[PDB]
Each structure stands twice: as structure tokens, then as C-alpha cells.
């Protein structure tokens, strides 16, 4: 064929495919016994697909003779030079992620390409892709691309990703066929061009500098949206996106959740690391199975009782004293509320299917209400802290120890301040003078079901003069 590379005489496999790992692969593909065995061009013409991923291949020299190749997979190798692919015009799909490729000029004349995977390479210049107008799928994340002008005429693209230095998205304007876009980990603030991409069903845009989401208003087909790690506050535009089932707004500056109130198709919602104090707008989102509300300003979490389908919930790093609103969410399997002010965990006995329970850095003094949660496999109860009600100071002051293990037995103090001692069930101090407070710590390994932790803490005891 014109442009094609062919052998005219029968040649050893190891003289065609000079890379030692590719010669061994081609020996198996071609049904030969040794890499020195000769093959003809007719033999090489039988190869239409090649799954050569994860073989330590440094060179694809010889692949130019496989004229009938339509689909290749050379992902997870050590390729740099891809010049042997230049004239393989029958190629429709190439999987070549996780290599050391910088120069993609050999892909320029592969007009029949509908799929091209090149993520995790060393590509800056994507100009060679500009005339691959039949491409439906193109993955370019984990590269050093800053200029996407070459994408402007790829008007058949349905799935697209790129990275990691892109600021200007203007070249995407005419790519209205786009359904699934991933612009994560770029230098993007201006997503105004995305308003043109009205066929978008999935938009992943994590770890950018986005503060203005008004361009998303008419993208009514969006079912999946991730703006995790941006500069969002005003999410009013989201009320228009009624088809959303999966929404990730973690690591922003959001306080007003009213725009999410009517997005009743939501099953997964991430709102961790924001400025939220009012979750009343979430009350009607009863299809939610996963909800993340960690690292906010929450106290009154009473509206969470409406979310009866929740199996996963995070509330860690808030100002919550009353955990009882989670108690009627009986499908809960993983619950995380470390770094709160919770003392009474008795309502948690109603979460009979709980597997992961993380409650460190609270004010928990008694594990007995959790004794029957035997389906637990992961447990966290370290570093509790609370201050008891004041007791009258006397020179020989005695308080009852109140720290109780899951068995109902008192846990002996690990340390006692001001030279105090322990004779079960009382901690006694004999003080040389009046002091404002005394204290003690505890540290006790414990297992409930198959979940193991250290139940520990610091108890501060005020003494009234």
C-alpha cells in the first residue's frame, strides 16, 4: 500500500521489532516459538489489534509494518518517540497514557482516529491533533498543556479532558457535541465559554480558581457536576440544574444552600470545607445516600433527620452538641463526627447497621450505649475532653471517676494532676493549698465488634473556693 512499510523477504521478528519486550510480545501474537523465527508481510498483515500495555517497551520500531492495525494499547510503558505510528492510517483507537511522550507530530495524519488517550505524558504542544476531526474521545490530563487552540475544530468530541496549565477555554466554543468534560487541575477562573456547551451531562472542574458559575445556567442536561476546590460562594445558578444527581462543592466559601433546595434527584452531595451554618434547605433532598458537611459552622443539624436514605455522612469539625438528629437515619453504615462537642451518644444505639463510627475529639465519657453495635469494623474514640461541674474545694478533695468502658466498668486514670491518686471508684487529691482546678487523663484500647481504637481523654475538674 502507498505510504505503508512492508517487508519483501521473510525476516526474523527480532530484526523488525528491535525492542526486546515488544519482540517477545509479537512472537506470542504471531504464534511463533522464538523471537528469531522469520515472518512474512502476510503474517504481519493479520494483526488488527494489539494489547501491549505494561510490558516495559521503550521503542515501537517495527509497528509500522502492522499496516492493518485499528486498535492499539501501549499504555503504561516507557515510550518517547512514536514515529512508527505515522502511516498507520487505519488506526481508530489509541490507548497511550502513562508514557514519556512529548512530540505527538506522528499522530497528525491519523484521520480515522475516534479515540485518543494520552494522559500522563510530557505533552505541551497539541497542534498535531488539530485535524483529527473524527475524534469522539480525547484525554490529555496530567500533561503541561497551556494552549488548547488545536481543539477548536474537533467538532465530534463527546468526551474530553486536558491539563495542567490551561487558563483560556475560548477554543471550546464550537464543540457543542461535548457531553463529558474534565478541566480539573488547570489555572481556570473564566468558564463563560461553557454556556455554549448545552449538551454537557458531566462537568468535572476541581482544583481551579472558579468563583463565577453563572455560565452553567442553561446547561440543563447536567447530571454530574464537581467544583471541589474552587472559590465559590454564590451558588444561585445551581437551582436551574434540576437534572443533577451528583454534586460536589467541597472546599469553597459557600454559606447559602437555598439554591440546592429543589434538586431532589440528588443522591450524592459534598459540601465539606465551606461556611455553612444552616442546612434547612437540604430538608427535601430525600434521595441522598451520601452527604458531606464536615468543616463548616454547624450546631443545629435537626434538618438532617429528613434524609432517611443516608448510608454515608460526615459532620467532623463543626460545633455540634446534639448528635440525636442522625439517630433516625437507620441505614447509616459510616458516620464521622470527630471534633465536635457531643457528650451523649445513646441515640446512636439505633444505628444497628453502623460499620464505621468516628467520634474522636468530642466530650464522650461513657461507651455503654454503643455496646450492641457489633457490626462495627472501624472505630475512632481518641482525644475526648470535657470539664465537670465544679465541686467544693477541701484539703482532701475526692471525686468519683466517671469514665466508663463499653462493658460498664470504670476505666482507671492514666495520669492524675497535682499528685492525685486512684482507689476505685474515687480520685483523691491532698492539696498543699487552694487551686482553681485539678485534672486527669485516661487511655484505654477498646474493640466493639471488629473496630478497634483508643478511648482516651482529658477531664478538667474545677474546685470552688
Amino acid at each position: 500500500p502507498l505510504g505503508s512499510a512492508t517487508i519483501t523477504q521473510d525476516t526474523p521478528i527480532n530484526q523488525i521489532f528491535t525492542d526486546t519486550a515488544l519482540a517477545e510480545k509479537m512472537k506470542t501474537v504471531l504464534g511463533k516459538t522464538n523471537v528469531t523465527d522469520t515472518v512474512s508481510q502476510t503474517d504481519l498483515d493479520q494483526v488488527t489489534t494489539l494489547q501491549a500495555d505494561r510490558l516495559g517497551i521503550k521503542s515501537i520500531d517495527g509497528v509500522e509494518y502492522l499496516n492493518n492495525l485499528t486498535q492499539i494499547n501501549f499504555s503504561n510503558n516507557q515510550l518517547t518517540d512514536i514515529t512508527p505510528l505515522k502511516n498507520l492510517t487505519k488506526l481508530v483507537d489509541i490507548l497511550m497514557n502513562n508514557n514519556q511522550i512529548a512530540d505527538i507530530t506522528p499522530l497528525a495524519n491519523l484521520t480515522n482516529l475516534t479515540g485518543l488517550t494520552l494522559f500522563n505524558n510530557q505533552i505541551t504542544d497539541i497542534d498535531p491533533l488539530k485535524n483529527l476531526t473524527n475524534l469522539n474521545r480525547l484525554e490529555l490530563s496530567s500533561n503541561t498543556i497551556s494552549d488548547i487552540s488545536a481543539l477548536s475544530g474537533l467538532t465530534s468530541l463527546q468526551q474530553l479532558s486536558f491539563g495542567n496549565q490551561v487558563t483560556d477555554l475560548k477554543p471550546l466554543a464550537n464543540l457543542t457535541t461535548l457531553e463529558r468534560l474534565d478541566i480539573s487541575s488547570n489555572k481556570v477562573s473564566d468558564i463563560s465559554v461553557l454556556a455554549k456547551l448545552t449538551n454537557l451531562e458531566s462537568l468535572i472542574a476541581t482544583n481551579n480558581q472558579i468563583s463565577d458559575i453563572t455560565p452553567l445556567g442553561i446547561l440543563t442536561n447536567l447530571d454530574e457536576l464537581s467544583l471541589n476546590g474552587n472559590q465559590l460562594k454564590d451558588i444561585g445558578t445551581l437551582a436551574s440544574l434540576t437534572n443533577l444527581t451528583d454534586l460536589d462543592l467541597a472546599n469553597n466559601q459557600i454559606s447559602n444552600l437555598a439554591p440546592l433546595s429543589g434538586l431532589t434527584k440528588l443522591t450524592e452531595l459534598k459540601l465539606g470545607a465551606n461556611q455553612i451554618s444552616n442546612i434547612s434547605p437540604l430538608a427535601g433532598l430525600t434521595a441522598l445516600t451520601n452527604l458531606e458537611l464536615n468543616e463548616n459552622q454547624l450546631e443545629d443539624i435537626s434538618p438532617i433527620s429528613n434524609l432517611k436514605n443516608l448510608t454515608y455522612l460526615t459532620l467532623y469539625f463543626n460545633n455540634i452538641s446534639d448528635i440525636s438528629p442522625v439517630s433516625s437515619l437507620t441505614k447509616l453504615q459510616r458516620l464521622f463526627f470527630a471534633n465536635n462537642k457531643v457528650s451523649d451518644v445513646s441515640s446512636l444505639a439505633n444505628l444497628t447497621n453502623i460499620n464505621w463510627l468516628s467520634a474522636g475529639h468530642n466530650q464522650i465519657s461513657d461507651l455503654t450505649p454503643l455496646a450492641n453495635l457489633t457490626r462495627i469494623t472501624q472505630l475512632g474514640l481518641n482525644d475526648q475532653a470535657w470539664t465537670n461541674a465544679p465541686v467544693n474545694y477541701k484539703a482532701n478533695v475526692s471525686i468519683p471517676n466517671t469514665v466508663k468502658n463499653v462493658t460498664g466498668a470504670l476505666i482507671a486514670p492514666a495520669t492524675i494532676s497535682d499528685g492525685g491518686s486512684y482507689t476505685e471508684p474515687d480520685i483523691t487529691w491532698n492539696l498543699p493549698s487552694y487551686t482553681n482546678e485539678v485534672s486527669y487523663t485516661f487511655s484505654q484500647p477498646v474493640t466493639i465488634g471488629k473496630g478497634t481504637t483508643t478511648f482516651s481523654g482529658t477531664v478538667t475538674q474545677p474546685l470552688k473556693g
Binding site: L138, S141, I204, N228, F317, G380, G451
Partner: protein, 104 residues
Amino acid sequence: GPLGSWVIPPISCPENEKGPFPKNLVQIKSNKDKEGKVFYSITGQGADTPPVGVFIIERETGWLKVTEPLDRERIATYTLFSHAVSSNGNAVEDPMEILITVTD
């Protein structure tokens, strides 16, 4: 104990997924990140040993991703281990076993 300050959602890995790849599965975190920066990594067959890089984790964000379509009837299960270290390379968590099941 083993859970420590880990926060891990359950992982759903359907076979024959749609791109673009890599596709996010879940975002893992250690709450030890409030006392200093945390760096995430993954080990196991399917991660650092063969098949290398089926699963990868973004070191700063904790985003665990799948790099290609999975095939139940080829490999049904993968045992991975998440790791969390500080800026000084010290393990801030005990490594967490993560059993990924390839569903329909």
C-alpha cells in the same frame, strides 16, 4: 487504632465505564491535615505493583481514580492500601486496606 483520623467513602467500581479517564472514584482524607499538610499515596497490585496504575491517587487532594475501564470477568477484586504522610515523610495514619469489587 487502625481507623485513626481516616475518612473514606465506600468505593463503587462499575465495569465498562465511560471516559474521560482517569475517572474519580472517591476523595480520601486524613483529619491529621488540620495540624499540617498531608500527602496521600496508594500501594497494592493494581497500584504500585502489577498491573501498575489501574488505580492512582492525587497526592495533595486525596482523589482516588481508576485509569481505564475494568472487566469483572477478567479481574473481579483488588486489594489496595491508602497511606497518609506529613511534609517530613512520617506516617500520620496506619495504612488502610481498601477492597474494591468490580460490579455490573
